[PDB]
Design a protein around this ligand. Structure first.
Ligand SMILES: Cc1cc2nc3c(=O)[nH]c(=O)nc-3n(C[C@H](O)[C@H](O)[C@H](O)COP(=O)(O)OP(=O)(O)OC[C@H]3O[C@@H](n4cnc5c(N)ncnc54)[C@H](O)[C@@H]3O)c2cc1C
Length: 292
């Protein structure tokens, strides 16, 4: 069930989505419904977001195990921020020990209120270090993915540096990568070519977040450094007080993006659902897919 193999032997573009482990029963109940609805569209793998600095690691392990019994293939996210190397290696072992064959090796953001990353006094500093750890201890027993930034990571000194660091991370042992969310496909195609030019040949999957609220869009882009197309921005701002109009605008925009990506031959599309199914399901259905 390694993503590396799923990509190579695919019969068409892979559908995947991400969810985060809830912090309450109401959250769990809502997530279960979301998993049920999206599972009907046959996801190749399902990402499990890793709480900031390991704050909810036990929950990640719990869900990595739980979705397998639901017939889903887990891509367990794992960061090195705010945790000792030992703590990281431990949770990593719990994932593998639980049947997880796919890991998304990440660094994690700085603590809240801090713009410059600082590692745990006894932890890793770069995602590449975790990729190396995973390979050194498990080899090709698991498939590893990493984050890519079409518009550059906020902390990178320059785009050239951002790309060099990504290549280094790939060289550490990545089978694939998933990009930060983007709203204009040009950002993605441009990054893809910059990558190929730099000698990177691994599959780089586009990460897409269909918008369901104006605030959501503004806040997510402000934090991740992604940009908003002027036309989309104007439309969402004008209809922000209308939940239905906003959902329609966001879904249509995502449909347009995804339709072109699929025609361009991407190997798959990764959806950021924020534990909600409506937007993603509407995009898939408007693209012509129907529940199994
Ligand atoms: C698909 C995806 C999934 C994500 N999932 C999660 C999640 O589950 N939990 C979570 O907390 N966050 C998650 N994030 C956010 C991510 O952790 C933050 O963007 C974080 O700030 C960077 O993580 P990274 O793995 O990209 O780091 P890195 O690749 O390590 O990059 C961090 C910074 O260090 C620089 N750098 C890298 N190597 C070097 C070097 N050798 N020398 C100098 N500088 C270097 C980079 O250019 C960059 O600016 C996700 C992001 C994406 C795109």
């Amino acid at each position: 069930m390694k993503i590396r193999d799923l990509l190579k032997a695919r019969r068409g573009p892979l559908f995947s989505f991400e969810f985060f482990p809830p912090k309450d029963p109401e959250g769990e109940e809502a997530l279960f419904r979301t998993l049920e609805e999206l599972k009907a569209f046959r996801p190749a793998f399902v990402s499990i977001t890793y709480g900031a600095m390991g704050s909810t690691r036990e929950r990640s392990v719990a869900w990595a195990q739980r979705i397998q019994s639901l017939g889903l293939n887990p891509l367990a996210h794992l960061t090195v921020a705010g945790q000792s190397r030992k703590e990281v290696a431990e949770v990593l072992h719990r994932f593998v020990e639980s049947g997880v064959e796919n890991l998304l090796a990440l660094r994690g953001d700085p603590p809240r209120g801090e713009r410059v990353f600082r590692p745990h006094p006894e932890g890793f500093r770069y995602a590449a270090e975790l990729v190396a750890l995973i390979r050194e201890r498990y080899g090709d027993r698991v498939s590893v993915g990493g984050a890519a930034y079409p518009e550059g990571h906020p902390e990178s000194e320059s785009l050239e540096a951002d790309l060099r660091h990504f290549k280094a991370k790939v060289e550490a042992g990545l089978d694939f990568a998933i990009t930060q969310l983007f709203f204009n496909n040009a950002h993605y195609f441009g990054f893809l070519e910059r990558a190929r030019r730099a000698g990177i040949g691994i599959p780089i999957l586009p990460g897409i977040m269909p918008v369901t609220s104006y605030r959501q869009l503004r806040r997510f882009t402000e934090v991740c450094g992604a940009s908003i197309p002027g036309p989309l921005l104007a439309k969402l701002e004008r209809h922000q007080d209308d939940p239905k109009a906003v959902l329609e605008i966001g879904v249509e925009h995502a449909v347009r993006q995804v339709a072109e990506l699929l025609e361009a031959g991407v190997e798959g599309v990764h959806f950021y659902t924020l534990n909600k199914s409506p937007a993603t399901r509407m995009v898939l259905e408007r693209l012509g897919l129907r529940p199994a």
